[PDB]
Amino acid sequence: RKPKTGILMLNMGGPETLGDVHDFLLRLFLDRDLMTLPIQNKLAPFIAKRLTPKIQEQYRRIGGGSPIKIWTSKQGEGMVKLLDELSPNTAPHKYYIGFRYVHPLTEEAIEEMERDGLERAIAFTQYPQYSCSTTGSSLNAIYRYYNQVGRKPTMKWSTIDRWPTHHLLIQCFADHILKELDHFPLEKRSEVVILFSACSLPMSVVNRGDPYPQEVSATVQKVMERLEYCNPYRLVWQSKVGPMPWLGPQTDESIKGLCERGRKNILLVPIAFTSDHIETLYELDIEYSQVLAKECGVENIRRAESLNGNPLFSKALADLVHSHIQSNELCSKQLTLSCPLCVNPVCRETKSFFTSQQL
Amino acid sequence: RKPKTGILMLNMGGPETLGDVHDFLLRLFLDRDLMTLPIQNKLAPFIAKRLTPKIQEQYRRIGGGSPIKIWTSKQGEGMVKLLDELSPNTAPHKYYIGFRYVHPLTEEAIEEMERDGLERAIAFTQYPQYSCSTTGSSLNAIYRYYNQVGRKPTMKWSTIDRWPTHHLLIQCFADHILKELDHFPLEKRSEVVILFSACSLPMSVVNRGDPYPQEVSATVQKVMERLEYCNPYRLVWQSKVGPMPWLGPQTDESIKGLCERGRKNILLVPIAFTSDHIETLYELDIEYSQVLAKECGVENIRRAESLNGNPLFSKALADLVHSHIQSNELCSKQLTLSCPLCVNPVCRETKSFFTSQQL
């Protein structure tokens, strides 16, 4: 009955209600692994307070809050149900949600995992493609937690730090793309252009050696091969913010560019997310698909459904955990290599934390 | 005996002797598909004249010229020898070299193909990953040739515009990587970090929608999967020139960054080339491996051998051409979609040239 193997599902997280926005932002601007700012401890709360109204407004526009926790919970529960049958030797399994910037925080989840007296602890990132700003930050949080609490872990840790091409992940994306293509008018099906849209990164980050771009590209290639290249495509990036240079082409500019060039039937695909969030429900669905799309004269613009509750996805999660357990992997080979230009000293410490785990 | 099917092998080309450097640079700065410049016809010759001495010196450092024509010739001959047995229906086959900036020029090749009175003409790019600046420019020259000569083609055209993940291309890279890893001291094999190095692109090109980065990334992923992720890796970009922003991380800075961080056993892999040229023999072998490496205190830095004369590569070429002929493909689906922000009007005309081909 008592849990033996815990699977900590890592994700940035998102505010559940408009009221959670302020703290979400605050924790986010306080994260050194994400950004360094002068008098950060004083500025952060300030920047959070001023951005709060604008961000709360974005969440109001999609219903009043993020569904991330609901979808994560459902995927986790489905995963556990399967794991108990897949790996009896490591059962019972229990999933824990460790959101980086909102409750339940990564730290709270770890505290709970230790209290449950687990034997196994698997840091399972929910970002298929690795970025030092996403998965890396979550992994650093785990290392820092123990380093700050001043005491070693009581469970054997390991991580599934990336999985950009897991065959079931690719199948889920391909299936969702195909069913969405079936939603376009029959006459336009073959004319549709697929825009794979992933979260962009500042060029300063890309230039230090971030693995993200290459991995996202890998996922896209895998999805397209499974679709047998039925339609032309392009990998574009969204969510750029600020005056600094980010990796492009931007998704909004691409949509606008495509229309002005006669390609008015577009299928957007959130290729770097496993569930819905503000980036898909607001940026892609409203900002680009409703507003921008109208101003540009698009004929048809649709978005592949996010993986969310697809039973195949829960199966994907379970297979990954199962394979990870059977291989005795502590982490991917890729995690043993820090960015060539990494300037964050905790990265090497975090890497060692997982590569040095007992058993 | 009379040639029936012609295979136009497209490549940038390189100066065979130091004396060819000047016209090489001249033709390169005159290409609108490559770069627009004020009073280009006047600036181009000037720019070529001032760069000539420095470029000639680079070629002198590697032996006095580029081996590209020699390697292209051997691969083409190997390809033809195989095609004559693989596809008796389209034999005899003849290969033609169409370098973009040096003799034999793409135009001279087309002129020769027409004189040979071929029935089938295949534009076979030698760049596995498509870039509007490489393959795109070569395809544009074919269209521009007929449009400038004021005559319709006498042969049925088609193109193999990209092949970033052909299984035999991937096996060739994997094989060369493994044999090069064997050259490292046994004690450091597992410590080696693989730097996949591809030619960089200015961010202005990346941002308009160039498919190159995503395709190179795809190749890297396939190679690593075949090597079963034996070693950690990172995809880096080389050859940045000028003050403008280019896609990074840069190969030279990554090598230096890796050394500073204790990773002194590096294996360089020219993932976007099929043979040796100035970028590998000079930039990677001399500039980075001999000079930069010494100043950084590298323990061991080697470079995977270029595909060059590997018989498996000629097999790859013949299989690509064979499958292309069997499928009646006119071009890839990807070619039917121009960059979302393309501003070159010839791109659409070039695309149409191939997609509209009779038969």
Ligand SMILES: C[C@H](CCC(=O)O)[C@H]1CC[C@H]2[C@@H]3[C@H](O)C[C@@H]4C[C@H](O)CC[C@]4(C)[C@H]3C[C@H](O)[C@]12C
């Ligand atoms: C200078 C620094 C960025 C440094 C960097 O290049 O990394 C930026 C990051 C966030 C900026 C702040 C935020 O944009 C919030 C405020 C915006 C106002 O227009 C100026 C003050 C303001 C308080 C900004 C001051 C300054 O320009 C900050 C602190």
Ligand SMILES: C[C@H](CCC(=O)O)[C@H]1CC[C@H]2[C@@H]3[C@H](O)C[C@@H]4C[C@H](O)CC[C@]4(C)[C@H]3C[C@H](O)[C@]12C
């Ligand atoms: C730029 C940075 C990622 C940096 C990196 O590549 O390491 C990302 C991570 C989380 C992002 C923030 C979060 O998504 C929360 C906010 C979302 C808003 O749409 C923009 C501001 C907002 C505050 C974002 C700013 C910026 O895009 C952040 C800070």
Ligand SMILES: C[C@H](CCC(=O)O)[C@H]1CC[C@H]2[C@@H]3[C@H](O)C[C@@H]4C[C@H](O)CC[C@]4(C)[C@H]3C[C@H](O)[C@]12C
């Ligand atoms: C846009 C937002 C300020 C909003 C506001 O004050 O209204 C600012 C505050 C801090 C900024 C971030 C920080 O300066 C850290 C990063 C600096 C890089 O040059 C761009 C990305 C980067 C992640 C910035 C993105 C964006 O410009 C942020 C998030």
Ligand SMILES: C[C@H](CCC(=O)O)[C@H]1CC[C@H]2[C@@H]3[C@H](O)C[C@@H]4C[C@H](O)CC[C@]4(C)[C@H]3C[C@H](O)[C@]12C
């Ligand atoms: C202005 C133009 C770029 C225009 C654009 O990209 O929008 C750039 C491209 C190449 C430049 C030229 C090349 O760098 C060669 C010369 C360099 C000298 O320092 C100035 C004159 C010189 C002849 C430059 C003039 C001008 O700045 C050019 C022509």
Ligand SMILES: C[C@H](CCC(=O)O)[C@H]1CC[C@H]2[C@@H]3[C@H](O)C[C@@H]4C[C@H](O)CC[C@]4(C)[C@H]3C[C@H](O)[C@]12C
């Ligand atoms: C920048 C441009 C590619 C632009 C694009 O992708 O659109 C590339 C194509 C060919 C390149 C040139 C050729 O490789 C020939 C020269 C090589 C030298 O090492 C630098 C100068 C040199 C003259 C290069 C300058 C620049 O990097 C060029 C002009």
Ligand SMILES: C[C@H](CCC(=O)O)[C@H]1CC[C@H]2[C@@H]3[C@H](O)C[C@@H]4C[C@H](O)CC[C@]4(C)[C@H]3C[C@H](O)[C@]12C
């Ligand atoms: C470096 C070289 C000038 C060398 C010299 O005169 O000493 C200049 C001449 C024309 C330049 C190119 C042209 O301006 C066209 C492109 C302009 C972009 O802003 C950078 C890439 C871009 C492809 C430039 C690369 C590089 O800076 C070039 C190739």
Ligand code: FES
């Ligand atoms: S920033 Fe990537 S490993 Fe440190």
Ligand code: FES
């Ligand atoms: S620049 Fe890419 S299609 Fe024209």
